[PDB]
Amino acid sequence: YEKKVRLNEIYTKTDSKSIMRMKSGQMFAKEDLKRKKLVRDGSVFLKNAAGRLKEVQAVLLTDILVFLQEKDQKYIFASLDQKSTVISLKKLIVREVAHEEKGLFLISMGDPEMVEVHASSKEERNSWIQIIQDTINHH
Amino acid sequence: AIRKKLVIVGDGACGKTCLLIVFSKDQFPEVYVPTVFENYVADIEVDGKQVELALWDTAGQEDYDRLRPLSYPDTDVILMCFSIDSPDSLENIPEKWTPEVKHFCPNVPIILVGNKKDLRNDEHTRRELAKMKQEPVKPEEGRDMANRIGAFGYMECSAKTKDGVREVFEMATRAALQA
Ligand SMILES: Nc1nc2c(ncn2[C@@H]2O[C@H](COP(=O)(O)OP(=O)(O)OP(O)(O)=S)[C@@H](O)[C@H]2O)c(=O)[nH]1
Ligand SMILES: [Mg+2]
């Protein structure tokens, strides 16, 4: 896994006009990806308020978690009912969704917001909770 | 195979987490950790109906007031608890928990639950309360409160002894299946 090579690919492929307001008030944009450090990326699904799923790329950085939708050959920051899809790892907590072994909950604790993410399997869901948790904890 | 979502609310320390775990795991959790956010699941069969109950555990501490509303969406039934050894927990039922639940979840059925029933007739407990001019909550006081807030039902339980635990969730499931 070549992390920096992967990050460069994700940067070059995201759309330069795509932006996402973080719950702090901080605006995140393409250029902000530039000098981040990549921990893991992979395909995942976000659950809507209406209960439906949308496929996204989860891009976990050392300091932030980012969800990207693919649009006409380029990445854009994923939309999910007014929720921020660029998430600071500070004050973030992670939990299993007990009733869905493919799911995890991300609760940003700044008002707070919770996002429900489903992996393609229990192993993948566990694997994702682990690395998100390691990275929050700086381990 | 029918899925339903249950949310439990009530004062810090009144027994919410021990009630969920005793129900879903049949084991009393020995170490008290105050809840920020957890969730559990249990299957239950009622009236020939098989239901997968999602159990959303919330923070009793008011420091987490901002956080609790994240648990209310899509809720089918609410357990609203107080502790039978704490008349002050009962009085927060109309003063705090009902107005909060009526703000976020106004048409969701509520089971009013008195927890810690094992303590009602416990001598040590009565003795301590009396030093304060207090008494354990009587079942009539819980029923009166259930009528006042318009609860779907009223139950009492002790997670510690398991007394009444199954019936609380049976009733909550019946309520969750309503509407
Ligand atoms: N005697 C007795 N003690 C109980 C009973 N249920 C819970 N407790 C005790 O009460 C304390 C708090 O219980 P707990 O279930 O963790 O409260 P909580 O309402 O979830 O607390 P919080 O997370 O909002 S701060 C613990 O010391 C626990 O063992 C019970 O049925 N009988
Ligand atoms: Mg608790």
Numbering used by the authors:
A (entry chain B): 2195 to 2304, 2307 to 2335
B (entry chain F): 3 to 181
Give the authors' words:
Value of the data• The Pleckstrin homology domains have long been associated with their binding to phospholipids. Direct interactions between PH domains and other proteins have been reported, however, structural insight into such interactions has been scarce. Although all PH domains from Lbc-RhoGEFs bind activated RhoA, the binding affinities vary greatly, ranging from an IC50 of 3 μM for PRG-PH, to over 150 μM for p115-PH. The overall structures of the two PH·RhoA complexes reported here are very similar; residues from the PH domains that interact with activated RhoA are well conserved among all Lbc-RhoGEFs.
The structure of RhoA·GTPγS bound to the PH domain of AKAP-LbcRhoGEF was determined at a resolution of 2.0 Å by molecular replacement using separate search models for a modified PRG-PH domain and RhoA. There are two complexes in the asymmetric unit. The final atomic model comprises residues 2195–2304 and 2307–2333 of the AKAP-Lbc-PH domain, and residues 3–181 of RhoA bound to GTPγS and Mg2+. The electron density is well defined for GTPγS and Mg2+ in the guanine nucleotide binding pocket of RhoA. Here again, the switch I and switch II regions of RhoA interacts directly with the β5, β6 and β7-strands of the PH domain from AKAP-Lbc. The structure of the PH domain from AKAP-Lbc shares a similar fold to other PH domains in the Lbc RhoGEF family. The two complexes in the asymmetric unit are held together by an interface formed between the α3 and α4 helices of RhoA, and the β-hairpin module near the N-terminal helix of AKAP-Lbc-PH that lies outside of the canonical core of the PH domain, and buries a surface area of about 330 A2. There is however no evidence that the complex of AKAP-Lbc-PH and RhoA forms a dimer based on size-exclusion chromatography. AKAP-Lbc-PH on the other hand, shows stronger binding towards RhoA·GTPγS, with an IC50 value of about 20 μM. A closer examination of the two structures reveals that the interface between p114-PH and activated RhoA buries less surface area (approximately 500 A2) than that between AKAP-Lbc-PH and RhoA (about 570 A2).
